[PDB]
Amino acid sequence: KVIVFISGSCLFGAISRSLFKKLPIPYTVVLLILGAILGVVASNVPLVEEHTRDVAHMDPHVLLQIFLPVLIFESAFAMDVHTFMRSFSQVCILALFGLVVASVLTAVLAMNLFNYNWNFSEAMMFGAIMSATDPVAVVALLKDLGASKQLGTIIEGESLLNDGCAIVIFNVFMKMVFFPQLTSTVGQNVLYFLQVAVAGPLWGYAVAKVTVFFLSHIFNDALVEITITLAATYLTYYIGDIWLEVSGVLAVVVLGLIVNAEKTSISPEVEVFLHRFWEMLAYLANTLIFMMVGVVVTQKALVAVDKMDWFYLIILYLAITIIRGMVISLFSPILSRIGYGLTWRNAVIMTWGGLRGAVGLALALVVENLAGNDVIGSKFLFHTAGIVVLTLVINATTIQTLLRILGMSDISIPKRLAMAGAVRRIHEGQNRTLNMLKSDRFLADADWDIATAACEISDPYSPREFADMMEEARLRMLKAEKISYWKQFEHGMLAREALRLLVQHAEVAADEKDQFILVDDLKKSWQIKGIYPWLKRKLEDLIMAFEVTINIAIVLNIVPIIMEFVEDALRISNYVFFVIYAIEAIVKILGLGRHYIVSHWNKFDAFILVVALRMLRLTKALIPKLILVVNGKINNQLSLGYDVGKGYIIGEEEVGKIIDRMVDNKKILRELKHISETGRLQVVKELGLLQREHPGIAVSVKTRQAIRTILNHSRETIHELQGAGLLDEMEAHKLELTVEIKMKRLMNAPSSIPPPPPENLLKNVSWLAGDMKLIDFIKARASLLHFDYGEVIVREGDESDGLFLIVSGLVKLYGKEVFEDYLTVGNVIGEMGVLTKKPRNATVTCETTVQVYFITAEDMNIAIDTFTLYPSLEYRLWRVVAIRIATPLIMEQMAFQGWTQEKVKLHLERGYLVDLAESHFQFNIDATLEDVILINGTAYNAHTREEIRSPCLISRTVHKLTFQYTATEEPRLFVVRNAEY
Amino acid sequence: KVIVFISGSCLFGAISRSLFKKLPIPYTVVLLILGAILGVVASNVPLVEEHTRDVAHMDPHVLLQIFLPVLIFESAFAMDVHTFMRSFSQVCILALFGLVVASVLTAVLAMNLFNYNWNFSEAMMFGAIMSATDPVAVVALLKDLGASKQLGTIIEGESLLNDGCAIVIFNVFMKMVFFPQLTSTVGQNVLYFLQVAVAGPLWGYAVAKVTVFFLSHIFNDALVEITITLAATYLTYYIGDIWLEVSGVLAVVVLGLIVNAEKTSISPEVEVFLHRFWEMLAYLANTLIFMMVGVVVTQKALVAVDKMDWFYLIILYLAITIIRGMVISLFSPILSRIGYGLTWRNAVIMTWGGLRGAVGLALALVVENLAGNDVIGSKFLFHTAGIVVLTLVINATTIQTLLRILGMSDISIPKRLAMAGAVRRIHEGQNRTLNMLKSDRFLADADWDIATAACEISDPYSPREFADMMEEARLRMLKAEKISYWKQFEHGMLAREALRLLVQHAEVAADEKDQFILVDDLKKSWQIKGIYPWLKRKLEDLIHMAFEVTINIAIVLNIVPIIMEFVEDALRISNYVFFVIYAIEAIVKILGLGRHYIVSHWNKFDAFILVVALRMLRLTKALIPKLILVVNGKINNQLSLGYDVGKGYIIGEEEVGKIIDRMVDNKKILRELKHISETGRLQVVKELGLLQREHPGIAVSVKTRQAIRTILNHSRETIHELQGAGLLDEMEAHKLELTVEIKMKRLMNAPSSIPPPPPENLLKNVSWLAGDMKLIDFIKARASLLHFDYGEVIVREGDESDGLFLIVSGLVKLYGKEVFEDYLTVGNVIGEMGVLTKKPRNATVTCETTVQVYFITAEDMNIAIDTFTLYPSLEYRLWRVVAIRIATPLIMEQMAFQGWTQEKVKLHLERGYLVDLAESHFQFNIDATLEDVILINGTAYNAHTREEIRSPCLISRTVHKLTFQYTATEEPRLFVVR
Ligand SMILES: Nc1ncnc2c1ncn2[C@@H]1O[C@@H]2COP(=O)(O)O[C@H]2[C@H]1O
Ligand SMILES: Nc1ncnc2c1ncn2[C@@H]1O[C@@H]2COP(=O)(O)O[C@H]2[C@H]1O
């Protein structure tokens, strides 16, 4: 019956796809040709005639209900959603206007020239059936050799919208023509138009949001989400099919776009499985419909032969080609003026990009089968088969020729240079490892000709002098900046979108002109000036159990509206609404203790309750949702702008220190350094102004990039640990799943701005001995002094003024060999100036804006006199300065070799100070104390009578020590007991 | 009509699967419970009654033709094929015997005790319907917490074979019971049995091989192979369904097993897509059939209430449980004796491993629907629903309790120690990178509490003294050997199977007893003593070519009308065509009769068949080379694997022997451990050497197949490092890495057939640059092929010069004098300066392995020198070789040639010549045209500074003119490179 035909069709499609892969002509036309052969065999042998008659004469219902929604759903599934949304406005405008112009022009051309006794509706149906297209072949060719990304997305989106509008027009006009028993008045026609406009896509959006919310609560389960997605898609299609014969495909398209847009709630395995499954179904449908078209056209059009239609076909193709070119040629200056400009290469490649696919053949089969025994169906089928089999080869050959000639698919010089360098590096490394392997003991009598020929690799590709030198120098500088950007991305310091924005900004201004870097485009990239801030300014300035119950009651009030739009239950529903109003009155009575005297907005709700249509109650809960989503929407773009600004700054800083060695001409080097430093200084001030506008964006981006850097380095560490054999494959995978989970949780990070860190709470918590004395010191010291870049607070050798503790920022200390230290938030500086009364010994500078608290010598004396009986703050300060002095001289010792900063920090935390007054300035060293450090003073050995002074390390050989008490130098020691105690 | 029921069924299955994931009870019983609820709603409301009446009363044809083949196909698709084949024999024996014993015991128990007026066929049907089971739940539980691999495969294979034989028996009896109008004589019954035996699986094998051969010619295309595989599976099922009512499932199972077995011709993406698609279909079918069973049993069994059946159910469950235990308990000693032994833990976990699934419920629905208005269908459905809903909870709880109690799912000490060490290392690295990141300029006012809490990680888990010390020392040594094996695998020096074999050999002898390493098990691992060599020995010793291939194809075509013979004018024309083919064969034989007219032993039978005029003998002689080549490949793979694992053990022991000494400090333990390790190494090296001696191609194959792996791994690491430095972007890196993946894929199907040994004369002529007739004369005057084994020194430093030696097989190590160590491979020339400079010796060369060398004496060297005198091109080439050998090491170490590798300085100095001192009268002028000037030999006097220098030395660029003094004992020699 039908089995052998389908199996043979699949085998023929497979062999045709495998054979004609190399030729630029798409495979599908071969299928059509093969179908033609079957026709001239179906007229003689009764067996193939029986098989074809059983299969090729199916009902239109199955075609119109199955073959088209699958194809349009596939055309609306494989597209990149974000790239589509980047140009949705121009794509929609161009697609709609091209569709309407092409349809009306084809209709009037047919009526004027064909000399057929047709009506206007037949010609409009002809135009609609000649308007639809399919871009899978041209986008496949572009993927193969076009070397472009945005062009295919533009073509796919335009084709999708064109197909949707074309099938809408064809369905309405076919229903008007072939069923001449329906009223065509305006009152229901406008209702039908608005229904198809608004009711369908909103229903698809609602079901998509519902199923996404359902899938959000599913963890590490793969079958459930696949089955739920398939069932939801079929349910949407079935409700659309019950509703109309048109809006179902629109609802399916919207649902597919929304599902493809979301990525956080669906694991990638499900997405790739769904892509593969839907692609397989679409390919099968396309092959079957092509073979059916071929066999039916060969069996039918042999009795409709004339020279007039053969003359008509060529001029029809010429007319549709010229109008398709002319509409976009006329609309190009408007697009250039509005800002969505496109190059003339894009226009000339768009002119030939219209390839007819399978939608037109489907509609032709439907309109031929519904025509009965009439010549109109044969004319339709023959003309559409002729035009598709003409364009499918001619347009493909011409687009390949134009893509070759225009040279946009040309490998640039840096691409070839980088590929050659990479190939040379790989070959050198392989030669080195071969040389190492040849020296191995067990690698003897291995034929090295086979080994060398097996692993060989190769690339797939194979004042004028001053101006040329400047041009090549700036090209090399652009190359260095690009590789710096890629290095920064690979180390993890950047996000994804900022990286591609920087790369494309560098590329579009690389070889266009002499200027290479611009700042105002970056300015508009990070700042927001569109309609969103104006909408926010208008919106936010012009305007739980009880709320949930009120919302549920308002939703329940739609059921009387449903009945009204369509009894005892309805009266009971009105009584329930009155009871809900009474419950609202009871809620007001309960809130009378808070506020019930008068209200402004609630008068409308009171009037609505007096009427009892309760949709006005839900807008109070709807108000926070709009601000909640728009604040995140603007903050995401603001964070991306700050990120790309920081990336440009750090890239310029990295490339600044290498340009001097690259060139040797003085004038070029000077002018390049001048323009680079002016650009950096111009952008850094605006970045600082953006930071000063609000501080939460910087905090968010720093705390969202530190996690990325830490996770990347942990992944590198675990890969290295796997490479050393200390753990096997399964444990490594089990541990790496945790890293993947951490990254997945980081993906949906709270991009909403975290509150700024507290001032008093962090002051009390960060210091160990937080008490009421700290509060008294804060009340006696409120400076919050701010120092910007390029300022030095104190200098070495200057007289001591007091103690300074930092509350915001990072500072760098240079002291004396020499050392460099970095103090973060919560550090205390100026310590020995109040204890040992030393003027100064080191210089501290600030690399950014810092907020600090100032304590003077008088303030320090007042603080010291504030607590005297139990100076816990003073004792903690003594411990802090003691461990600060003792820390750097222990890790460098040979005894503590192989110890990190945290190891020596946590080793010495369990140590105290020695009371020299109780011990009468005499100490005995035993094995109980693990470490003894001379903090201050001069110590005299009780055995060797040797005098030593701080900074020094007491050896384990010394057992008894004596100290001399002096007012100007009081001896101090730190003792850490053994870890076994 | 049917849509809402299916949609609600899928939603209920989804919510039940999501909710009951944590509890050890499988989700499916909840579905059954939910179905029960629908029943007590279907009896009152006419709407749900209409929906249930429409969907749940489905005809048996769709169930019996759709629901069962999908389930059995899924049970025969997700299995690991190789692990199944490792124990196929014991799995088949145990499954078949357990099935037949359980079926007959259930039948006789039902007939004796149930007091129902049933026949023997009804009880056999009852046993067949109670024998089937499903492995999905138990294997899922074992994947979750069983911590085992082989047990799940054993259970799955047993369940698959049991299901296939059970459905065969059920069909062959149900076709007799409910259709009492068919003859049951032996003559057709034995034909049916042999038909199911041989016709089905062979047809599945043929279609699988045909579609694999079809898919082998498809490159980088994904849709075509998926569509072809699906169409081939349906075509196999349809031909099986037309053929018999039960052969289709067997053919589909065989086709699925063969498709899953193959891996080279199918890309992994297609395989995982097919796995996911088939699993989705099976899950949907299982959920739907469970809900159907629940609703039908609640609607039906409410009018079949008694205490007799409610008492019979418990004793039936007890009887089937005890017989299932007892059959394998009785068969365990036979398995232990035969060598396929299993531990008592495996037996006690296999006893409770029988969980009834969906096949029995499918057969119950079929038999209940075909029973009509009779009590037998209700009894069948109620009893099977009761037993499945009892076992599905009770057996799951008991198997979880037993798995906890028996302690086989316990984390060992080394696992916890390694996990803790890895966690500590990761935390230390993260702390270090956080400390580095805190000092960055642009990382200011970032709340570090959130950063620390976000990236925190943790593990999922949380003379007696002398003997204890020895035990912990040998455990630590085993851990060191295991990590050495993993390091060797990760560096790329091992294959996959040898790695897992060595790891499991280390594991099974780790904590069992005091001994740790055995050698005779490795001996039987690398050597072959099975039935394969004996069958090869008896087989291969007991037994215009294109036109012959065309004649064989025609003889194959002659078999096509034989189907008509088994089944007119066309048949007579077929006989005439066969006679014409016979005449053509006779003409071909007469043409070949000039070379050989007498018929051979097989040719006499061929002539007899031609007189008969069959092609079976021609096909057999065509497939004789096929069986020869597949036997050769099968034996060579095992030999290569054994040699690989032997080499891996040797290099692992060599690595661990250097580090074992530092680990322990007790003298006696260290001495005895070194003694046993060295005795094992010395025992295994001699056997490996003789194994390599017996046939040398295996070693050549394994070396040339592992060098490519090492080179490709290091190239991949280099490309990853280059990507990490930003010199190329993502797309170019992926495009380049595709080439590495293609190289690895081509290496996967490597020519494991043994390459021929390298030639002797051809390599001697080609490897040397100046190969000519003089080399042939030297070979005729020097044929030594001396073989030196390990531990032998050929010459020593200071001994008198004897001649020149050129190495033809092996690698040697030279120690000379600072001091230097050199490695000479095949094709090197040694002992060259001893005849040129008349020097005795200056360095000592030894051999690290067996070496085959050619010996040339001083008299032979003099004869060779006197052989070519007019144009001694061999002598000129030797002078160039010794000149470049002397000049090479002293240039790369110079500051001028800094950053130059060995190949760079080798290819830089190849465009160099010698200076003729006779033509220049021993005076040379150095200009900028010559890039490098090297004093090879002699004393050079500067013409300006009057300074005397001698080789080895480097002439600086400041020196312009030089003079040389000619001496017989020291002739000056120089080399100049442009
Ligand atoms: N080794 C050190 N590490 C960190 N900070 C130091 C070190 N030595 C001195 N300082 C700080 O530098 C300050 C310089 O002036 P003061 O002596 O007032 O107090 C000193 C300490 O706060
Ligand atoms: N630098 C070197 N590198 C490699 N081989 C050498 C080197 N120097 C000497 N030889 C070889 O060692 C041999 C020792 O004895 P002969 O002098 O007969 O010939 C010598 C050369 O073949």
Q: Residue B435, CB half-sphere, CA atoms under 13 Å: how many? A: 12
Distant-in-sequence contacts of A336-344, Cβ < 8 A, 24+ apart: A340/A87, A340/A89, A340/A90
Residue B832 lies in a domain: yes
Rounded to whole angstroms, the Cα distance separating B14 from A227 reads 8
- Domain check: are B229 and B352 in the same one? yes
Rounded to whole angstroms, the Cα distance separating A882 from A900 reads 19
Collapsing DSSP states into helix, strand and coil, what is residue A189? Answer: helix
Residue B489 lies in a domain: no
Taking the CA of residue A881 and the nearest CA in chain B, the distance in Å comes to: 21
Residue-range definition of the domain harbouring residue B166: 3-406
Rounded to whole angstroms, the Cα distance separating B269 from A173 reads 45
**Preceding peptide of B840 cis, ω within 30°:** no
CATH code assigned at A840: 2.60.120.10
Rounded to whole angstroms, the Cα distance separating A381 from A365 reads 7
Burial of B183 by CB count in 10 Å (0-12 exposed, 13-18 middle, 19+ buried)? exposed
Rounded to whole angstroms, the Cα distance separating A688 from B667 reads 70
Residues of B in contact with A709 (CB under 8 A): 433, 437
Q: How far is CA A648 from CA A493, A701, A915, in A?
A: 12, 15, 57
Among the candidates B816, B848, B883, a domain finishes at B883
Q: Which residue from B279, B419, B434 is facing A731, i.e. has the nearest CB?
A: B419
Rounded to whole angstroms, the Cα distance separating B659 from B664 reads 10
At B686, list the tokens. Answer: 């001699």
Rounded to whole angstroms, the Cα distance separating B173 from B128 reads 9
Rounded to whole angstroms, the Cα distance separating A763 from A757 reads 11
Q: Residue A196, CB half-sphere, CA atoms under 13 Å: how many? A: 18
Breakpoints of chain B, after residues (C–N > 2.5 Å): 462, 543, 567, 613, 817
Number of domains into which chain B is organized? 5
Check CB contact under 8 Å for B727 and A483: yes
Q: Cα torsion at A605, A609, A610, A612 (round to 10°)? A: 140
3-state SS, one letter per residue, for A512-569: CCCCCCCCHHHHHHHCCCCHHHHHHHHHHHHCCHHHHHHHHHHHHCHHHHHHHHCCHH
Residue B491 lies in a domain: no
At A357, list the tokens. Answer: 């696919």
CB atoms closer than 10 angstroms to residue A791: 11
Check CB contact under 8 Å for A703 and B451: yes
- Domain check: are B176 and B100 in the same one? yes
Mutate to test the interface with B, among A16, A267, A445 (most CBs of B within 10 A): A445
Binding-site positions of B: 831-834, 841-842
Taking the CA of residue A751 and the nearest CA in chain B, the distance in Å comes to: 14
> What are the pocket residues of ligand 2 if the criterion is a CB atom closer than 6 Å to any ligand atom?
B 801, 814, 816, 822, 830-834, 839, 841-843, 885, 889
Rg (CA), chain B: 40
- Interface contact B894, partner A, CB < 8 A: no
How many Å lie between the centroid of ligand 2 and the Cα of residue B828? 11
Check CB contact under 8 Å for B224 and A14: yes
Q: In sequence order, what are the beta bridge partners of A813?
A: A821, A844
- Interface contact A709, partner B, CB < 8 A: yes
How many Å lie between the centroid of ligand 2 and the Cα of residue B763? 23
Listed by number, the residues of chain B in 666-685 with a beta carbon closer than 8 Å to a beta carbon of chain A are none
At B415, list the tokens. Answer: 């696992």
Residue B497 lies in a domain: no
- Residue the block writes with tokens 């050619």: B854
Listed by number, the residues of chain B in 402-441 with a beta carbon closer than 8 Å to a beta carbon of chain A are 415, 418-419, 421-422, 425-426, 428-435, 437-439, 441
Please answer whether residues B211 and B263 qualify as being in contact, where contact means their C-beta atoms are separated by less than 8 angstroms.
no
Residue A827 lies in a domain: yes
Rounded to whole angstroms, the Cα distance separating A253 from A164 reads 9
Please answer whether residues B274 and B226 qualify as being in contact, where contact means their C-beta atoms are separated by less than 8 angstroms.
yes
- Domain check: are A36 and A141 in the same one? yes
- Mutate-to-test residue for ligand 1 from A832, A881, A887, highest number of ligand atoms within 8 A of CB: A832
Rounded to whole angstroms, the Cα distance separating B35 from A269 reads 32
**Residue with CA nearest ligand 1 atom 17:** A832
DSSP-based helix, strand, coil % in chain A, nearest 5: 65, 5, 25
Distance of CA B646 to the CA centre of its chain: 18
- Domain check: are B900 and B942 in the same one? yes
Identify which ligand lies nearest to the alpha carbon of B815. 2
Check CB contact under 8 Å for B722 and A222: no
Please answer whether residues B349 and B151 qualify as being in contact, where contact means their C-beta atoms are separated by less than 8 angstroms.
yes
The structure's method of determination equals cryo-EM
Mutate to test the interface with A, among B148, B491, B688, B711 (most CBs of A within 10 A): B711
Residue A713 lies in a domain: no
Q: Which residue from B441, B747, B903 is facing A431, i.e. has the nearest CB?
A: B903
- Domain check: are A324 and A392 in the same one? yes
Q: What is the DSSP string of B825-861?
A: -TT-EES-HHHHS----SEEEEESS-EEEEEEEHHHH
Among the candidates A578, A607, A624, a domain finishes at A624
- Domain check: are B425 and B342 in the same one? no
- Domain check: are B896 and B844 in the same one? no
Provide the total of helices (H) and of strands (E) in chain A, helices listed first: 41, 16
- Domain check: are A813 and A913 in the same one? no
Check CB contact under 8 Å for A650 and B442: yes
Check CB contact under 8 Å for B700 and A280: no
Q: Which residue from B712, B758, B901 is facing A455, i.e. has the nearest CB?
A: B712
Atom of ligand 2 nearest to the CA of B842: 14
Please answer whether residues A222 and A274 qualify as being in contact, where contact means their C-beta atoms are separated by less than 8 angstroms.
no
CATH code assigned at A130: 1.20.1530
> What are the pocket residues of ligand 1 if the criterion is a CB atom closer than 6 Å to any ligand atom?
A 800, 815, 821, 829-833, 838, 840-842, 884, 888
Alpha-helical regions (H) of B615-696: 615-663, 667-694
Residue A356 lies in a domain: yes
- Mutate-to-test residue for ligand 1 from A841, A859, A885, highest number of ligand atoms within 8 A of CB: A841
Rounded to whole angstroms, the Cα distance separating B578 from B598 reads 24
Contacts of B858 (CB under 8 A, 6+ apart): B801, B802, B803, B835
DSSP-based helix, strand, coil % in chain B, nearest 5: 65, 5, 25
Check CB contact under 8 Å for A426 and B722: yes
- Domain check: are B817 and B835 in the same one? yes
In B344-370, which positions are buried (b, 16+ CB within 10 angstroms) versus exposed (e)?
eebeebbbbbbbbbbbbbbbbbbbbbb
- Domain check: are B223 and B361 in the same one? yes
- Domain check: are B786 and B894 in the same one? no
Please answer whether residues A295 and A35 qualify as being in contact, where contact means their C-beta atoms are separated by less than 8 angstroms.
yes
Among the candidates A406, A424, A439, a domain finishes at A406
Residue A821 lies in a domain: yes
Beta strands of B431-470 (E only): which ranges? none
At A836, list the tokens. Answer: 């040992």
Residues of B in contact with A16 (CB under 8 A): none
Rounded to whole angstroms, the Cα distance separating A316 from A114 reads 10
In A114-133, which positions are buried (b, 16+ CB within 10 angstroms) versus exposed (e)?
beeebeeebbbbbbbbbbbb
Cβ-Cβ contacts under 8 Å between A and B: the total is: 277
Length in residues, chain B: 978
Phi/psi region, residue B803 (left: phi>0; alpha: psi -120 to 50; beta: rest), is left
Nearest CA in chain B to A704: B451
- Domain check: are B901 and B813 in the same one? no
Q: In sequence order, what are the beta bridge partners of A811?
A: A823, A846
Check CB contact under 8 Å for B433 and A734: no
Rounded to whole angstroms, the Cα distance separating B963 from B972 reads 10
